[PDB]
Amino acid sequence: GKGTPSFGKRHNKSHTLCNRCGRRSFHVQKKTCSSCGYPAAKTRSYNWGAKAKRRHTTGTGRMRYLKHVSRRFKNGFQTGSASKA
Amino acid sequence: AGVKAYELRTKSKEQLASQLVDLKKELAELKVQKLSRPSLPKIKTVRKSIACVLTVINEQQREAVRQLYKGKKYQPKDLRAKKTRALRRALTKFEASQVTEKQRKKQIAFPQRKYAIKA
């Protein structure tokens, strides 16, 4: 009975969505994400998980602010406006 | 087509607010037609004109706040400079050029001299 019949008793979700990573790794009874470690302040990561780091590191998303930092640096973190040459 | 910002910057705050509400009315009147007609790209110009007007209003308000806080320390944290966290925490070129009276005297007495070796 440990097979096909026991798979029919599976209707209670151990993990739900995580508010930090949106993944369905948030444990409902432990109150902890299996993937990111929320609510811990540090993001869960391990050097034995190289692919896991590559999946979730910088550059996998939008870089909403960090994209423009190289450009602002190249221009010198200048201030003001251009002046109609 | 749409509005141009250079002919809005000559206007006052109230004129711009009236312009804005009129444009929003036009945008609603266009959204009620978009569902009747198959296509309506005139809505894009109205959206961008609303954006231009709001940008000009924001600029007018921020410059007035700048002039209010002109020439006094402790101005707001959206009118300050953003440069970076580390560069904002770095020592100024005053604090970094500070030296002791001992080192000033030695810099004055024995500076690096300009010497050449021919004769």
Partner: protein
């Protein structure tokens, strides 16, 4: 029947209808559609005619 911001409540919907269309409101009912938008059924008073102000809004 209006499409409504997902952040708007019934107070705001009532006030906005009274503002834009100059109509008194009796009741507001709201649902969130399966497409993620909000739908407002606004029942006006007997003095006003939704049929007469819809074609003024520009749809019928």
């Amino acid at each position: 029947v209006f499409q409504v911001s997902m952040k708007a409540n019934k107070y705001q919907i009532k006030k906005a209808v009274k503002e834009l269309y100059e109509v008194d409101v009796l009741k507001v009912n709201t649902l969130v559609r399966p497409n993620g938008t909000k739908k407002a059924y606004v029942r006006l008073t007997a003095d006003y005619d939704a049929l007469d102000i819809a074609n003024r809004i520009g749809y019928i």
